[PDB]
Ligand binder design. Structure first.
Ligand code: JKY
Length: 282
């Protein structure tokens, strides 16, 4: 079926939970043996969210190459994304090592450091120009260059230096700051505006390594971001845009990381975002 009318048909019939449970039943199951090794317990935020072995990002280190991060490679859309958890106190150096080694231009953050009164990720970037950060375990230096605070999101320019080679690179930090502590946003308008700002920066384009996107677990809000982006790109590429099947795209992405889209409300919000976004594109 088309999307907008499939949408109204699920609303009128109140069957979002049944649709979402079908997706969960059909989703791929692949091994994640490296994630579960005992030496990696303090590298995982949640025991039930792990990268598959076949698609995990490897650190360029011979001691321990493990990080909780996955490469989502979308062949028809010609887009790639790295989805990862929010960094932990003992993985902030690994996080920036990955950004460096994978040649990413942008980092997309969809959570606040504190939500619901608890810490959802480490304070992993500097908040003042004159107070830079040094990650001694991976030999990197990170400096805040500029910051632009808007009503729904903040954009930061960061300098990452590889202290071993003295090479430097400019990284863009796109921080969506207004996702509610509970539920999903009422309108997709600010989330779509944010997606378009990431696109306009070049961070999603083939001349750079894959964008790094995270929330707390790296599957819920993060999944919504890449699902909406890929569906809108396919609607632009194909002769028949009504042929784009959001449930099929989501199942394809779940071949590369488990659990993408965590609730039926996030599924409905993804439909809403793609539907509204397709009208603005034209
Ligand atoms: C977590 S696991 O890797 O041990 N199991 C996944 C699995 C899926 C499907 C089949 Cl046929 C077999 C195994």
């Amino acid at each position: 079926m088309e999307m907008e009318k499939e949408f109204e048909q699920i609303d009128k019939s109140g069957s979002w939970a049944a649709i979402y449970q079908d997706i969960r039943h059909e989703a791929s199951d692949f091994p994640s043996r490296v994630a579960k090794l005992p030496k990696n317990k303090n590298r995982n935020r949640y025991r039930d969210v792990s990268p598959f072995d076949h698609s995990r990002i490897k650190l360029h280190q011979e001691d321990n190459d493990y990080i909780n991060a996955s490469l989502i490679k979308m062949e028809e859309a010609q887009r790639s994304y790295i989805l990862t958890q929010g960094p932990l106190p003992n993985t902030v150096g690994h996080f920036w090592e990955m950004v460096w080694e994978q040649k990413s231009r942008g980092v997309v953050m969809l959570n606040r450091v504190m939500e619901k009164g608890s810490l959802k990720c480490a304070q992993y970037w500097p908040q003042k120009e004159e107070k830079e950060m040094i990650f001694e375990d991976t030999n990197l230096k990170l400096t805040l260059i500029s910051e632009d605070i808007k009503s729904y999101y903040t954009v930061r320019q960061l300098e990452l230096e590889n202290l071993t080679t003295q090479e430097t690179r400019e990284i863009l930090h796109f921080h969506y700051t207004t996702w509610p502590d509970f539920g999903v946003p009422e309108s997709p308008a600010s989330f779509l505006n944010f997606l378009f700002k990431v696109r306009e920066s070049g961070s999603l384009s083939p001349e750079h390594g894959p964008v790094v996107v995270h929330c707390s677990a790296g599957i819920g809000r993060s999944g919504t971001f890449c699902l909406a982006d890929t569906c809108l790109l396919l609607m632009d590429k194909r002769k028949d845009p009504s042929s784009v099947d959001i449930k099929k795209v989501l199942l394809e992405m779940r071949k590369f990381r488990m659990g993408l889209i965590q609730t039926a409300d996030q599924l409905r919000f993804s439909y809403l975002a793609v539907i509204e976004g397709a009208k603005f594109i034209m």
